[PDB]
Amino acid sequence: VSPTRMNLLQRRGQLRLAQKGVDLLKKKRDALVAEFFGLVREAMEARKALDQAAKEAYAALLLAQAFDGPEVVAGAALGVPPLEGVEAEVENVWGSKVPRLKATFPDGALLSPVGTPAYTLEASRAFRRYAEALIRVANTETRLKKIGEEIKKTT
Amino acid sequence: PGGDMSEPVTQSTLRIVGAFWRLDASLAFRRHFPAINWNGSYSLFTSALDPWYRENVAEDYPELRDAISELLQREAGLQEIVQLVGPDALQDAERLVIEVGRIIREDFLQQNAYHEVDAYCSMKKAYGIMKMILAFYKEAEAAIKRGVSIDEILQLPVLERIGRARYVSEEEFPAYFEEAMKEIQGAFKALA
Amino acid sequence: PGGDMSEPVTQSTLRIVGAFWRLDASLAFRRHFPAINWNGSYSLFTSALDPWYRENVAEDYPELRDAISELLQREAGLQEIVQLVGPDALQDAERLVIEVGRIIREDFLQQNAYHEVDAYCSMKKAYGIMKMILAFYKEAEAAIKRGVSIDEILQLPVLERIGRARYVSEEEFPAYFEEAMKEIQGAFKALA
Amino acid sequence: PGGDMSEPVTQSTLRIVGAFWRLDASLAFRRHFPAINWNGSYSLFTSALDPWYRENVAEDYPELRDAISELLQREAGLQEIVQLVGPDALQDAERLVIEVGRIIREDFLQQNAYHEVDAYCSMKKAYGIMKMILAFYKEAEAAIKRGVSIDEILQLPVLERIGRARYVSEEEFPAYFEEAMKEIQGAFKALA
Amino acid sequence: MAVIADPETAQGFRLAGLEGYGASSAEEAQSLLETLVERGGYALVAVDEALLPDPERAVERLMRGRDLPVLLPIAGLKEAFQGHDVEGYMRELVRKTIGFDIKL
Amino acid sequence: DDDRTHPIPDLTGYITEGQIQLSRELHRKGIYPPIDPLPSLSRLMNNGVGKGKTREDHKQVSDQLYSAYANGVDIRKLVAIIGEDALTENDRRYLQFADAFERFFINQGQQNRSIEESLQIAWALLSMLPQGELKRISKDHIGKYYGQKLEEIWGAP
Amino acid sequence: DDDRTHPIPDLTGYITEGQIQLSRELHRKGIYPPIDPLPSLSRLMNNGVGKGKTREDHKQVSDQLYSAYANGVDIRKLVAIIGEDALTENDRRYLQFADAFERFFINQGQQNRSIEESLQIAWALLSMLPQGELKRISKDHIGKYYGQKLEEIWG
């Protein structure tokens, strides 16, 4: 940098631009924190709903395993077809792309049209609703993680 | 001496001339000519020549010139953020302004003094180029709000039609202009 | 010339003066007067003045002054918390010191020169106000380990006794001081 | 004056001298003596001394010197990345390059003028030290391809052998050199 | 999706069509988890919280450049019938994210 | 060279009582006169305003306009990064206030406006902001002047 | 002190008809000759080149090389802020073009290249860019010389 008056003015203009950029990035960090502090509340609500789902599904499975017998429960488990009906579509948030989990969850494709076992069918229903809540929990938590990473990158 | 514009002769000349055409070394390094610094240049004869321009060129020519100046000012405003967070952090409505400013800078302002055709340019040719650029910008601005991603727009073949209108001869320009204006509408209706 | 204390006159003055009352326009923007930056100011006469203070004002005056300065310092060390996380989300032990810092900034470090009695403040009055504020602070802290809602503490009527101690007259201050001394204890014993 | 390399005495000297040994205050602060800036220094006699080197120390000495210079250049290139992106963001090869550059900087370039042994270093001792460092680098870059983690390589006991090598006396160095030339291969052969 | 848990309740997960697995301890858990991260096709893996509280960092050496499979911990039998501090878990998320540990 | 530390601008500020600074960006946007209200200042303003002369609501209106324009200017820069949809309602109203302010108040052209017309336009611009956010103005003047629409100058800019 | 604004180089540039400026950065990387192309200039270049003198595509190739090298050097400054992994696909082409240009066109050693070989190398370097981005070259020369791969010369 050769010392001239024009270069001095150019340096002072750069200092002004740097200060204004610092303030603008501070405002962006404020907005990101504002989004994060609500996303965490939604995630907490989803987790505490998933806990109740776990309670009732585990109660149903535990009661069905003893009364009916593990043999018929296993037979129903082989009877039920496996499902891979999840499509990882990608959601755009804050200039970055995150995966969003969408579940197909078809009805009527499963076996046992009527409940020939006494309690296994209810346990299957409870665990299916468990999966339906678990996908929501994962969906909110991944967005929380990405927003946190953006906050760290800005700071 | 050394490009220092605070020289006594440079400062004395600044206080008596009516127009000031400042040149930049950074533009001459990358072979961008005439290398006029848009930010540091000015002219005081702009407001007095409007009655001549309206009668001899077109009725809306000063409005087009002011719109071009406003676009250049807006592009100059956004460049402080591009240096700070990169070009990709901008929204598509601002990326459109950046790309239109780049198109204006590389097409309208740039001129080759040694080329066989581009060395001389009449006022009506420049008016046609300005009209084409503003029509493209308006169509692109309308397309963004409809839902088209900007990466679709800046690959249309009409960009090469615009970008090579410099080398069209003076006698052949009216047909090229009327073809390009129809091509703009033909291209921008098929996006979404 | 521009707020830069690097000019020759300011260094030449700083080398010999015994006190330095740095003003700031930021506190004037908030209409907080006197607008004195208490973080950049200093004084070199404190060490030689306390044999006068603890003989003509009160025996506990110097230690009370250092306690008040420590309380002011602790509020300034939490700014990088509040500028990132919202002020209301903080813990009780930090919200308490933030509120006591606000109380200091608004009820002790603020003065009205156009008021009838607030324009001039004596040492006994200032000592009484500082004792009043520390009596509030210690009992609020002790209530915090006792375990209560912090919002109830911020609502208690002794806040009015804190604020209205400025505008009491000089000759009738001690009765007000004794009343507030019994009142803060009575109010915090009434709290659960 | 003040470390300014643009003053006339330095500039008049640089136009006639054949070698330029630039010192740095940053290296002197951290006690990294002789504190020669290996990026700003140069020598114009390197090409004319190679026939003497090929006869008096080894035929492969210039190649080893060029390899060490290339490693230092790569290390300097990565030092701009590590400081503001984070050392963990680098891949295994880049972390290995950084660690080998640190080993070169601390074990070979550094020399203590007051130690009873390190004050003087012969040519063959330095040649053996470069052979040790480059043999270690080759073995490490070969072992990284086998999936070994980098921090397991930094815990290898053979690192201390290279570190203490410059303190070995001139007469005892050839015996130490062969033991190092066996241990370097042995440790990396037994390493996963 | 895939889910590893206690061997008592993997039958509940295959009862809903999920690819449930049973794990007895931490070493079986991390080996099996590495097996689910090496092959492709599945987009979500669930791990018992009492078995492996950090399902992603235990394998982070393998997806330093991809994040398609979501790795997430869930409550097991020991937490389901008596409850556990999900508020403490979320305070821990705030711990790793902001770094200040402030909330009321 | 636009250097405010140059001796001629430096010594003039030591003898004079404020300054009015023209802006090049406002001139390039086509606004005339290009008077930028942020760095401009009049030091004897408080002695020539208040009841007994001009109008009694002058000072508070000027302060409110200054603060609102200062907010809108930085909201306008924040928009370019975070997008318009990420803002709250108040930030969008501040942005629109800044745009309408630059469009109507500063850009008067060759009009000869009296003080009453300027105050009317100022109160019309403040009406776009919601009531209660006008912190610097007392309720007495707000209950007297707030509420007029912009149509007087909006119909003929 | 490598200062271009020193009075002696300043007046020499004002008097002479161009200059050849060496670069210390290219010297540190081992490139010989270390000629910096951007600050260099030749005023009488237009008189001695063109059709019937050297070849018909000389000037346009020179202009395109200048523009592409300037773009690559500009991208090198963006990489220092956002990191090279966050670049678009287009900018990586310019970055690799700049690196290959510095490593092959400038660096030649003591060999004596003819004008035809230099133009062949220049056309091989321009072929790494998309055909639609050669704005300064007429389509007649593009249809005649484009498409040649750099490995055909050094392999």
UniProtKB/Swiss-Prot annotation, chain A:
Record's keyword annotation contains Ion transport: yes
GO BP annotations, alphabetical order: proton motive force-driven plasma membrane ATP synthesis
Alphabetically ordered keywords of this record: ATP synthesis, Hydrogen ion transport, Ion transport, Transport
Entry's Gene Ontology molecular function annotations: ATP binding; proton-transporting ATP synthase activity, rotational mechanism; proton-transporting ATPase activity, rotational mechanism
Family designation: Belongs to the V-ATPase D subunit family.
Physiological role: Produces ATP from ADP in the presence of a proton gradient across the membrane.
Protein name listed in UniProt: V-type ATP synthase subunit D
Species, as recorded: Thermus thermophilus (strain ATCC 27634 / DSM 579 / HB8)
Gene of this entry: atpD
Curated annotation (Swiss-Prot), chains B, C, D:
Top-rank lineage group of the source organism: Bacteria
Physiological role: Produces ATP from ADP in the presence of a proton gradient across the membrane. The V-type alpha chain is a catalytic subunit.
Similarity remark: Belongs to the ATPase alpha/beta chains family.
Name of protein: V-type ATP synthase alpha chain
Organism: Thermus thermophilus (strain ATCC 27634 / DSM 579 / HB8)
From-to range in the entire protein, with total length: 387 to 578 of 578
From Swiss-Prot, chain E:
Segments forming a coiled coil: none
The keyword Heme is annotated on this UniProt entry: no
GO BP term (any one): proton motive force-driven plasma membrane ATP synthesis
Keywords linked to the UniProt accession: ATP synthesis, Hydrogen ion transport, Ion transport, Transport
InterPro entries in UniProt: ATPase_V1-cplx_f_g_su (IPR008218), ATPase_V1-cplx_fsu_bac/arc (IPR022944), ATPase_V1_fsu_sf (IPR036906)
Domain of life of the organism encoding this protein: Bacteria
Gene Ontology molecular functions: ATP binding; proton-transporting ATP synthase activity, rotational mechanism; proton-transporting ATPase activity, rotational mechanism
Function per UniProt: Produces ATP from ADP in the presence of a proton gradient across the membrane.
Protein family according to the UniProt entry: Belongs to the V-ATPase F subunit family.
Protein name: V-type ATP synthase subunit F
Species in which this protein is naturally found: Thermus thermophilus (strain ATCC 27634 / DSM 579 / HB8)
Swiss-Prot record, chain F:
Family per similarity comment: Belongs to the ATPase alpha/beta chains family.
Role, per record: Produces ATP from ADP in the presence of a proton gradient across the membrane. The V-type beta chain is a regulatory subunit.
Protein name (database record): V-type ATP synthase beta chain
Gene name in the database record: atpB
Full-protein positions shown: 318 to 474 of 478
